Short mmCIF file of C-alpha atoms in Angstrom, two decimals:
data_model
loop_
_atom_site.label_atom_id
_atom_site.label_comp_id
_atom_site.label_asym_id
_atom_site.label_seq_id
_atom_site.Cartn_x
_atom_site.Cartn_y
_atom_site.Cartn_z
CA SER A 1 0.26 -0.03 0.05
CA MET A 2 0.47 3.86 -0.73
CA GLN A 3 -0.07 6.56 -0.64
CA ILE A 4 0.55 9.81 -3.10
CA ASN A 5 -0.53 13.54 -3.72
CA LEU A 6 -1.52 13.91 -7.42
CA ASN A 7 -1.67 18.12 -8.00
CA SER A 8 -5.47 19.00 -9.71
CA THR A 9 -3.74 21.97 -12.33
CA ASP A 10 -0.52 20.04 -13.25
CA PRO A 11 -1.31 19.79 -17.86
CA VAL A 12 -0.91 16.26 -19.49
CA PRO A 13 2.60 15.45 -20.65
CA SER A 14 4.80 17.31 -23.69
CA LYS A 15 5.46 14.34 -24.65
CA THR A 16 2.09 11.80 -25.25
CA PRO A 17 4.56 9.01 -26.38
CA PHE A 18 5.11 6.64 -23.11
CA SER A 19 9.02 6.11 -22.45
CA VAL A 20 11.69 4.86 -20.02
CA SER A 21 15.08 7.65 -20.17
CA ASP A 22 12.98 10.43 -21.07
CA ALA A 23 11.72 13.35 -17.76
CA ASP A 24 9.14 14.89 -19.74
CA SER A 25 7.63 11.54 -20.64
CA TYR A 26 5.28 11.13 -18.05
CA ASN A 27 4.44 13.25 -14.81
CA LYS A 28 5.43 12.05 -11.91
CA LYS A 29 8.17 8.92 -11.14
CA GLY A 30 7.40 6.29 -8.11
CA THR A 31 9.22 3.05 -6.82
CA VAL A 32 8.81 0.55 -4.56
CA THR A 33 10.79 -2.85 -3.30
CA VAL A 34 9.48 -5.63 -2.18
CA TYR A 35 11.45 -8.85 -1.38
CA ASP A 36 10.39 -11.99 -3.31
CA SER A 37 10.65 -15.69 -1.34
CA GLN A 38 14.21 -16.30 -1.56
CA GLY A 39 14.05 -12.52 -0.12
CA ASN A 40 16.11 -10.39 -3.20
CA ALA A 41 15.19 -7.14 -2.95
CA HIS A 42 12.18 -6.35 -6.05
CA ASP A 43 12.50 -3.30 -7.52
CA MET A 44 9.06 -2.28 -9.41
CA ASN A 45 8.83 1.51 -10.59
CA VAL A 46 5.50 3.53 -10.87
CA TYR A 47 5.52 5.39 -13.54
CA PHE A 48 2.86 8.84 -12.73
CA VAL A 49 1.26 9.60 -15.96
CA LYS A 50 -1.89 11.71 -17.39
CA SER B 1 27.38 -31.63 10.39
CA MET B 2 27.06 -28.35 10.24
CA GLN B 3 24.55 -25.33 8.83
CA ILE B 4 25.52 -22.71 6.36
CA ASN B 5 23.99 -19.51 5.20
CA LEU B 6 24.62 -18.54 1.65
CA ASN B 7 24.10 -15.76 -0.68
CA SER B 8 20.48 -15.98 -3.13
CA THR B 9 22.48 -12.09 -4.07
CA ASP B 10 25.46 -14.22 -5.45
CA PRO B 11 26.77 -14.02 -8.10
CA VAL B 12 28.44 -16.58 -11.05
CA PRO B 13 32.85 -16.28 -10.20
CA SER B 14 33.63 -15.23 -13.24
CA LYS B 15 37.36 -17.31 -13.42
CA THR B 16 35.57 -20.50 -14.37
CA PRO B 17 38.13 -22.98 -14.21
CA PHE B 18 38.88 -23.77 -10.27
CA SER B 19 41.62 -22.87 -8.47
CA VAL B 20 42.79 -23.74 -4.76
CA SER B 21 45.53 -21.18 -4.74
CA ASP B 22 43.27 -17.87 -5.60
CA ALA B 23 40.81 -16.83 -2.88
CA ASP B 24 37.37 -15.87 -6.10
CA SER B 25 38.15 -19.36 -6.84
CA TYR B 26 35.88 -20.40 -4.33
CA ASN B 27 32.16 -18.45 -3.22
CA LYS B 28 33.69 -19.62 0.94
CA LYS B 29 35.68 -21.84 2.55
CA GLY B 30 35.23 -24.64 5.64
CA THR B 31 38.34 -25.67 7.74
CA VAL B 32 36.21 -28.45 9.80
CA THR B 33 38.53 -30.35 12.44
CA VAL B 34 38.43 -34.02 11.99
CA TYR B 35 40.01 -37.13 14.68
CA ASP B 36 41.35 -39.97 13.30
CA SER B 37 41.60 -43.11 15.84
CA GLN B 38 44.97 -41.96 16.99
CA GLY B 39 44.38 -38.36 17.67
CA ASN B 40 45.74 -36.21 14.60
CA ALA B 41 43.74 -34.31 13.67
CA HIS B 42 42.67 -33.29 10.39
CA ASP B 43 41.51 -30.05 8.97
CA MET B 44 39.16 -31.04 6.72
CA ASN B 45 38.55 -27.70 4.14
CA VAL B 46 34.88 -27.20 2.75
CA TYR B 47 33.98 -25.12 -0.38
CA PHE B 48 31.54 -23.17 -1.41
CA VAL B 49 31.56 -23.19 -6.02
CA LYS B 50 27.84 -21.05 -6.76
#
């Protein structure tokens, strides 16, 4: 579980197609780390786009 | 009997051919003292390689 605040006045990103390493490709970036059965840390990026 | 806790995030050692004179060739070293019927101490070494 996680909680996030969204900007109600934030415009849509200029570049409509989604990218992985572009600053303007999406609005906000989020990261969540979980552990598998073996205990290894898995980094799951959460991308916020409008 | 021994109990060894290993690392799942341990990468395979770079050197493909096993070496006894190089530490990187084996992931872990395990000395075990074993006694015979005379009293001599056998320094048994157990090597972990992933």
